[PDB]
Ligand binder design. Sequence first.
Ligand SMILES: [K+]
Length: 140
Amino acid sequence: WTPPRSPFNLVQETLFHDPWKLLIATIFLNRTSGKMAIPVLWKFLEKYPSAEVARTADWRDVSELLKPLGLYDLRAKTIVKFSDEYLTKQWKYPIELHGIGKYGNDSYRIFCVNEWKQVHPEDHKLNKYHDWLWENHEKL
DNA sequence: AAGACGTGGAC
DNA sequence: TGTCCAGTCT
Ligand SMILES: [K+]
């Protein structure tokens, strides 16, 4: 399964193939505008192209990148921890992991795994994509 | 179960 | 230049 590209161009639609990156993007989005987060996200995946790399990194460093997006200290610490657990903790769903809640888990379950029918989003853009999936899956 | 984490954009 | 605001945690 591979989720369709939509007319709303969510970040999730590129990152689906790597559930880790997709969960990072969701976290970058926590209480922060896309307008600001998205450029920083891309530079973050440059410096930290994976989970094995990221569980390693100094949070002090992740932080430098994250201020000016606010929520930078706690988040930087989370990002490192999330990546540790992502790789070293067994999980069926990323909800089980640190700093992933209904939002990250919904994205996971719509994009990384064929479970869209069972997701009940409460994020706007996700709602748009989902509604749009319900409407057009039989067409593909 | 309530804060609490946060900057810069929009205005 | 002041307020409002863009999930998941403890
Ligand atoms: K969690």
